[PDB]
Amino acid sequence: IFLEVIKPFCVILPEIQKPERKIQFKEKVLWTAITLFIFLVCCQIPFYWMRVILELGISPIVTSGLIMQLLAGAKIIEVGDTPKDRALFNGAQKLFGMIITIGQSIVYVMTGMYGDPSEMGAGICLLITIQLFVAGLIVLLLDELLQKGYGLGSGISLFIATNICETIVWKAFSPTTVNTGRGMEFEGAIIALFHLLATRTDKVRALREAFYRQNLPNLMNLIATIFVFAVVIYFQGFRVDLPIKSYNTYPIKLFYTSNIPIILQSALVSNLYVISQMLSLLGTWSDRAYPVGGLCYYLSPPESFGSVLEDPVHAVVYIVFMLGSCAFFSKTWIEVSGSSAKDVAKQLKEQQMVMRGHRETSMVHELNRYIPTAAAFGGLCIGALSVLADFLGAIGSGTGILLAVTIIYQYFEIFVKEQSEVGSM
């Protein structure tokens, strides 16, 4: 009178064992590589077909699991970790996501996202069924093998991060041809230099090329991107620590507060925008559609440097909600993380671990000072960085770098542990 709903659908799903084995990185090489091959093959396989060469996949596994992590609010998961539920909060996602992906797939098949709803053949519905069902479920079971420590943890993270590696840096050097309507031009912005040199005496104009190209845009965007990439490592590496008792310490997690929110913060705005556009003083839009009137236009993000030059006053309105959500609407993620004082306290009691100096019991009041304050520069300024980069134009980076390079950090400290085993030996 929903945990009862788990029973009819649970352990039927395949699962995999844990190893009773001392597996090393050199040994894990392959098992990682498999995941790489699979994901990349999905990336690189599908005028409209030509544009396509240049649609759920991973995204359901993210969104469904995070949604369940939000539904953990109102103490709902305080049913609490036990052998009888030793993974079933995850297991629920394993089916709920699966069916939500199938629903989405059917909805766009009914839409006919590509193709009229019968004349190309109903068999393509079967095709899309198998395609997405297989793809998504295999991808998930990859991430499971990695979390099972045949790898390291999340794969999907690393996967999207690798996609970001390509979709950023590929544009630096890809020698693939482009045409303006002038003749032979190249995708890889940098190397064009060497052919320009054979083309023109006009070195100054060859350099201004680094500042012009409006599509697959000019190097100056890359240079900004590089600078952002370099800088952020400074911020992310910082961390703080407390002594712990049954010469050992608990590292207070810091930018862990940054990890979750920005997805939601960006999404909510983007989606309400989309909604208002579809439903329609509130907002009116020009051709990628963009706002050009109503409140949504006063609200619109002034990404263009032209927007700077035309009016500075507008930008405050965008800042007010975009940053203010980081300031205040984020505060509720104590429940989403499940890391209020009386949550972290419970967790540490399960750990059965206590600090020096004062009582376990009053440690609630002790840690309270640190708990809200973590939300400040630990979170909001990563949004400020994101917007910095985006309005400087760092290519796709104000989403990507934030997670991708953090994952590089995690992989670095793993790489340190294992390869430092090599270096010590």
Binding site: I16, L30, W31, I34, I38, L127, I130, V134, L145
Partner: peptide, 21 residues
């Protein structure tokens, strides 16, 4: 042992559908 053939084999075989389509 078999996880490699679990996760890879069916997918690389599932190439065939778009091979013909």
């Amino acid at each position: 042992p078999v996880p490699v053939l679990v996760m890879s084999l069916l997918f690389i075989a599932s190439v065939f559908m778009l091979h013909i389509w």
